[PDB]
Amino acid sequence: EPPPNICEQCLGDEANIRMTKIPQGSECKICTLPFTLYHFKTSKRSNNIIKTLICVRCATQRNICQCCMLDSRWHIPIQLRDHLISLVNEENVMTEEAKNDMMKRFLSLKNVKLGGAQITSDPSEADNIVDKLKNILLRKSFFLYNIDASIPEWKITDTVSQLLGILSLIVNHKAKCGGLRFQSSELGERFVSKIRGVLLIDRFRIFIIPWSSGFSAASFGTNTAENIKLSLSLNKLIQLEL
Amino acid sequence: PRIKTRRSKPAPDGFEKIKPTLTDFEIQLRDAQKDKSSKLAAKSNEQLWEIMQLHHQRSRYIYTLYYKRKAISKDLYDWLIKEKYADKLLIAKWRKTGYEKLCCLRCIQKNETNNGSTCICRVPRAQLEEEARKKGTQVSFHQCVHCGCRGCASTD
Amino acid sequence: NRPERIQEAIAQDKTSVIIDPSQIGSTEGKPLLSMKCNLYIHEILSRWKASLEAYHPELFLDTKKALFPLLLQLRRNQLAPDLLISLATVLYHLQQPKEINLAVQSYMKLSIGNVAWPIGVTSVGIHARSAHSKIQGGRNAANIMIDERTRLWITSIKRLITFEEWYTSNH
Amino acid sequence: SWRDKSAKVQVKESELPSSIPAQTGLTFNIWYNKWSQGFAGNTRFVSPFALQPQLHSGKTRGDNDGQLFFCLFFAKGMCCLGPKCEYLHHIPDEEDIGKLALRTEVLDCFGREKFADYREDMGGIGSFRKKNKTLYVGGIDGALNSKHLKPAQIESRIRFVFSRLGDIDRIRYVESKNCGFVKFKYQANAEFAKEAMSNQTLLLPSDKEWDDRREGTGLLVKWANEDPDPAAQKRLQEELKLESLNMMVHLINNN
Amino acid sequence: PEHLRKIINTHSDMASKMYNTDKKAFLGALKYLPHAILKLLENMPHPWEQAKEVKVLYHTSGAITFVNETPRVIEPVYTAQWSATWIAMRREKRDRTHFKRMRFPPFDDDEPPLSYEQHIENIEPLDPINLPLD
Amino acid sequence: LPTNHNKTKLLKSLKNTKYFQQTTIDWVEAGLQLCRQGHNMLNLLIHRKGLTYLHLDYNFNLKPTKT
Ligand SMILES: [Zn+2]
Ligand SMILES: [Zn+2]
Ligand SMILES: [Zn+2]
Ligand SMILES: [Zn+2]
Ligand SMILES: [Zn+2]
Ligand SMILES: [Zn+2]
């Protein structure tokens, strides 16, 4: 009858926390075996009830807690800590998650710490991979050019909102082009005052155009074979700028 | 209430003077017994809170006429106790000190709560505002579960 | 009030009976086809008033009583689609000289038609299998004998078919 | 805005449709609340209720109670108790998802429980293993009531609809497969939009079929797979490595 | 009693999702159903009384309704009450020229069982089997 | 001989929870409610198994709707 893994973030900033154990509560959300489920409240007057959703063996197989489903030592997701261990050891340590029911039960009952659980288990190799991490970190409408595919729409909204004081937006990523739209007459005048000027989001340069046409998404292209062709022609137009 | 039988006595004098109030409570219970649409669960429990409110107000009315105003005699009050127009126990808790205003019998039992304490509606509203000020948030309690009373301690 | 409706609908009664076999399948002209199916039955009964003296003087009043719901339901487009289409098929095959047998064939696509198990044998034998429920019908695509009053005019249609046979025969 | 006003009664209690579904069988199974002895005709239907965010947002009891789980029937647009609902009746913004940072990889933003992996249909609540942000948007045929449109107009309609539901990373309608892939800034915005445009229509009130709106079967918003072209795998791997480098900095600052 | 009666009236639809755990309670209450039948048939109202207002436990979901109290009667009073009904039924078999036995079952199979508050609570009961005591 | 250490009963073990509640109703109302609740419980036992064609009548006659 092992006591649960619940880390310091799920329980919260209290010293006296009253949880409720139900023996054989529910099937765990990894292996669908029943287990003793502990549900509680972070405060006494919390509106959210927080319960363990995995069993103890599935918790210790991933070295994770049972409530917030992040690492016991680091409080981070399983996939990303496996990615960080792959960045350190040059070995693709991945968590082999099952998909068949019998495979889920089989993969939980065995005595092993799978995935990247063994590294963060003892604190010695934890701090070893931590200072290896330190060694790694020692080593009224407008048109928009020059939007590489790693530039989302929400960053294009956020930087234009930050340069102003706070309006919709339409970006064709397969055409690699952008557009902005609003209603206020003075807002376009203030957008001209706060500058084909350049938007600098993260040093990635986006050229602006006062677009007197009322663009729809059809103006960026009607099909996908038009989008890549217009993106190539507009990159050649950017080379004509340069 | 309880059905009128041969073994039940006729009412003592003065009962026909208070029949319109008890009859209003009776016809409101007749309306509130029928099932509504009642699809949700938060508004399924409210149509039990209406019946707990009607039973509380009927017993409060009989308590008010007997103990507070002294208009109903002991014979008529004992007849209204026999015919189950009002609980002995709710009126008895209203006789006690500290339980003068009270929601229902369920919300003073420490036997039914998971913590072994009374219900949250017995906490005063000022104490809930003090703990809301000490935590920083608002008062995170609005409506009690067993009965719909927002706050039913003897002060508030 | 009512006599102006008498004037208008008798002046419309005297204003075609040849059913176009394109207009039978033309579902958009359903009120016009229903009105033509009304008026050709009126023309049959007007002919059967004339030769009544030597052919069944007892059924003319019965057929007038029995077609009164069909005369009710044909003037203002009150029928079923397949029922009206099959009735128009009958009345188109009832205007041609040698198509009396095709008229009764169209009648037997009217009265029974597409639907298998018209009445329903309703759980014969001992065993009464689980599939044995779909071979009985009180509703849900059983027949078009779904009313006394409806079947009454359906019967009167073939009464007029038999009169049309006798009328084209002895003339 | 929505911080100023209170949330509205989107529907009365009597104005809800009954929980008994459309009859797809002979008799009603009152345990599973479904129909049996026959399966012909769709269980699925166009939802009668839409969201309408800017009208129906507002401040509920959930702001007073301090709870930050959103309302599944605000997103469907079918709450009876408007200003009294225990959950939140507004769009998930940045600060609310920021207060969801402790629990949004375990539960979703509605309090539902995230399961092991997806369904075989890839639609439902979601996983705690994929930080899933991209929503497959199919079912556009009956969502238009099988109306002939150009793909740019349909992409514009899907962009304008899912712009009401939070911050957008990236939308790409597929002309060859008649589906979109709506990716969001946060995971909770994707959850809220999946609940929001569940089985609604892309029909505008400016079109003639507005009376026959609820005839066919509406949208199909579901969780999407990875984007199997290697360019989006490249942008996925490099954005995941940049977020991992941020978490490198966090783990060094912690210990 | 109106709280119990409202719970039993709200469990006639039983089509929402909210009844799921309540429906679990119904399937759990069958293995406590027949005990309650004994608790009816012990507390069965005798012919000398009209209706016996009885204590009863009800589940919060209205799953099972256990009549709570046990019928205790004084032994000489019990045999005297039943002997009074014995002599009264002998008199009303002799002096009655035509005795009409009940129908069985008293209701149709298609008829739902009747609600107490809409058909029985507002009708006052009849006169029970009582011998005229001189 | 009855057991001597039977301090547990059935209803006395159900009063001590938060789910059952004490009240005083007519016997006829208690009987009509045990008929309604017994119909609901047997109907749900039938309907969980999927026996939706066994129309358990209100007089508790189990009859198959179809053959
Ligand atoms: Zn497990
Ligand atoms: Zn945790
Ligand atoms: Zn209270
Ligand atoms: Zn209370
Ligand atoms: Zn309380
Ligand atoms: Zn809500």
Curated annotation (Swiss-Prot), chain A:
Signal peptide from the UniProt entry: none
GO cellular component, one term: nucleus
One function term, GO molecular function aspect: pre-mRNA binding
Gene Ontology biological process terms, A to Z: mRNA splicing, via spliceosome
Record keyword RNA-binding present: yes
Keywords linked to the UniProt accession: mRNA processing, mRNA splicing, Nucleus, RNA-binding, Spliceosome
Disulfide bond sites: none
Note: Present with 4260 molecules/cell in log phase SD medium.
Quaternary state and interactors: Belongs to the CWC complex (or CEF1-associated complex), a spliceosome subcomplex composed of the U2, U5 and U6 snRNAs and at least BUD13, BUD31, BRR2, CDC40, CEF1, CLF1, CUS1, CWC2, CWC15, CWC21, CWC22, CWC23, CWC24, CWC25, CWC27, ECM2, HSH155, IST3, ISY1, LEA1, MSL1, NTC20, PRP8, PRP9, PRP11, PRP19, PRP21, PRP22, PRP45, PRP46, SLU7, SMB1, SMD1, SMD2, SMD3, SMX2, SMX3, SNT309, SNU114, SPP2, SYF1, SYF2, RSE1 and YJU2. Interacts with SLU7.
This protein's name: Pre-mRNA-splicing factor SLT11
Organism: Saccharomyces cerevisiae (strain ATCC 204508 / S288c)
Name of the gene encoding the protein in the UniProt record: ECM2
UniProtKB/Swiss-Prot annotation, chain C:
Record family assignment: Belongs to the PRP18 family.
Cellular localisation: Nucleus
Stretch of the intact protein here: 76 to 247 of 251
Quaternary context: Homodimer. Component of the U4/U6-U5 tri-snRNP complex composed of the U4, U6 and U5 snRNAs and at least PRP3, PRP4, PRP6, PRP8, PRP18, PRP31, PRP38, SNU13, SNU23, SNU66, SNU114, SPP381, SMB1, SMD1, SMD2, SMD3, SMX2, SMX3, LSM2, LSM3, LSM4, LSM5, LSM6, LSM7, LSM8, BRR2 and DIB1.
GO cellular component: U2-type post-spliceosomal complex; U4/U6 x U5 tri-snRNP complex; U5 snRNP
Organism in which the protein naturally occurs: Saccharomyces cerevisiae (strain ATCC 204508 / S288c)
KW Nucleus (keyword) present: yes
Keyword Cytoplasm: no
Protein name as catalogued: Pre-mRNA-splicing factor 18
Record-level GO BP terms: generation of catalytic spliceosome for second transesterification step; mRNA splicing, via spliceosome; nuclear mRNA surveillance
Keywords recorded for this protein, A-Z: mRNA processing, mRNA splicing, Nucleus, Spliceosome
Gene: PRP18
Task performed by this protein: Component of the U4/U5/U6 snRNP, binding principally to the u5 snRNP. It is not absolutely required for the second step of pre-mRNA splicing at low temperatures but is required at higher temperatures. It may stabilize a particular conformation of the U5 snRNP or orient the U5 snRNP within the U4/U5/U6 snRNP or within the spliceosome.
UniProtKB/Swiss-Prot annotation, chain D:
Name of the protein in question: Pre-mRNA-splicing factor CWC2
Keywords: Cell cycle, Metal-binding, mRNA processing, mRNA splicing, Nucleus, Phosphoprotein, RNA-binding, Spliceosome, Zinc, Zinc-finger
Origin: domain of life: Eukaryota
Stretches assigned to the RRM domain: 133-226
GO terms assigned for molecular function: pre-mRNA binding; U6 snRNA binding; zinc ion binding
GO CC annotations, alphabetized: Prp19 complex; U2-type catalytic step 1 spliceosome; U2-type catalytic step 2 spliceosome
Annotated GO biological process: mRNA cis splicing, via spliceosome; mRNA splicing, via spliceosome; positive regulation of cell cycle; positive regulation of RNA splicing; spliceosomal snRNP assembly
Function summary: Involved in the first step of pre-mRNA splicing. Required for cell growth and cell cycle control. Plays a role in the levels of the U1, U4, U5 and U6 snRNAs and the maintenance of the U4/U6 snRNA complex. May provide the link between the 'nineteen complex' NTC spliceosome protein complex and the spliceosome through the U6 snRNA. Associates predominantly with U6 snRNAs in assembled active spliceosomes. Binds directly to the internal stem-loop (ISL) domain of the U6 snRNA and to the pre-mRNA intron near the 5' splice site during the activation and catalytic phases of the spliceosome cycle.
Zinc finger feature spans (C3H1-type): 65-92
Entry remark concerning the domains of this protein: The C-terminal RRM domain and the zinc finger motif are necessary for RNA-binding.
Effect of residue 184 to D: Inhibits cell growth
Organism this protein belongs to: Saccharomyces cerevisiae (strain ATCC 204508 / S288c)
Primary location: nucleus
Intracellular or extracellular location(s): Nucleus
UniProtKB/Swiss-Prot annotation, chain F:
SS bond partners: none
Cellular localization per UniProt: Nucleus
Origin: domain of life: Eukaryota
Record remark on domains: The MPN (JAB/Mov34) domain has structural similarity with deubiquitinating enzymes, but lacks the residues that would bind the catalytic metal ion.
Miscellaneous comment text of the record: Present with 468 molecules/cell in log phase SD medium.
Known function: Functions as a scaffold that mediates the ordered assembly of spliceosomal proteins and snRNAs. Required for association of BRR2 with the spliceosomal U5 snRNP, and the subsequent assembly of the U4/U6-U5 tri-snRNP complex. Functions as a scaffold that positions spliceosomal U2, U5 and U6 snRNAs at splice sites on pre-mRNA substrates, so that splicing can occur. Interacts with both the 5' and the 3' splice site, as well as the branch region. Has a role in branch site-3' splice site selection. Associates with the branch site-3' splice 3'-exon region. Also has a role in cell cycle.
Assembly and interaction partners: Component of the U4/U6-U5 tri-snRNP complex composed of the U4, U6 and U5 snRNAs and at least PRP3, PRP4, PRP6, PRP8, PRP18, PRP31, PRP38, SNU13, SNU23, SNU66, SNU114, SPP381, SMB1, SMD1, SMD2, SMD3, SMX2, SMX3, LSM2, LSM3, LSM4, LSM5, LSM6, LSM7, LSM8, BRR2 and DIB1.
Protein name: Pre-mRNA-splicing factor 8
Protein's organism: Saccharomyces cerevisiae (strain ATCC 204508 / S288c)
